[PDB]
Homo-oligomer: A and B are copies of this chain.
């Protein structure tokens, strides 16, 4: 059975003081890390502070990684550097980076390749827009996005997929847990056909739409939803209840 995977994407939020308060509350939750993956993704400059405050039961990662290796790439953080610091996970292809920083499918591929080369675990995001869904292009879009990078996966425990329903993020539309489930099943089928049956049954596929204390249980109970990449709710002490839903 697939190990559930609950992730906190803090995005560009936090102070030293707020993180101290939040991590303390997180540490009060007793869970078994051998049965459940719980991963926190602070801002890069907060990583050291965050890692030191969180008990080891929480895994940690960064919100982005360079497509380039070490060298003359001012402002970038390489996979090699992340590995040397024992940073376990990286987020790749978050829709915000695709949107504001024009990250492409090829950038995502190259980031994944670098991450795996340096023995990092990767949380890889993709998903279709409102226009794409309205044109009935969900499967076509996700197929292309997944096929951009899927052949790079060797160990299907170490790459975790995230479906972001962009059509339901800042559009006024909302995704039901069932509608998420339908796409998740479709994603798993794509992995099945591009990679293999065993591989597909192994891979974690997370929901990356709006997740809160009220809807997390309805989401996690869906057969092909293996967890979540959680936004604003993960900046709240009540995030522990979101973790509880996967326990």
Contact = CB atoms under 8 A, between A and B. Distances in A.
- Chain A binding surface, main DSSP class: loop
Interface of A: 9, 11-16, 43-49, 62-64, 66, 68-78, 81-82, 84-85, 87, 91, 94, 96-97, 100-102, 231-232
A64 B74 contact: yes
15 contacts: A12-B69, A12-B71, A15-B84, A44-B77, A48-B48, A48-B49, A63-B74, A64-B75, A72-B231, A72-B232, A74-B91, A75-B94, A75-B96, A75-B97, A75-B101
A15 B118 CA distance: 14
A74 to B, nearest CB: 4
Nearest to A82: B45
Contacts of A14: 81
Contacts of A73: 11-12, 96, 100
Contact of A71 (B9, B11, B48, B71): B11
A146 to B, nearest CB: 20
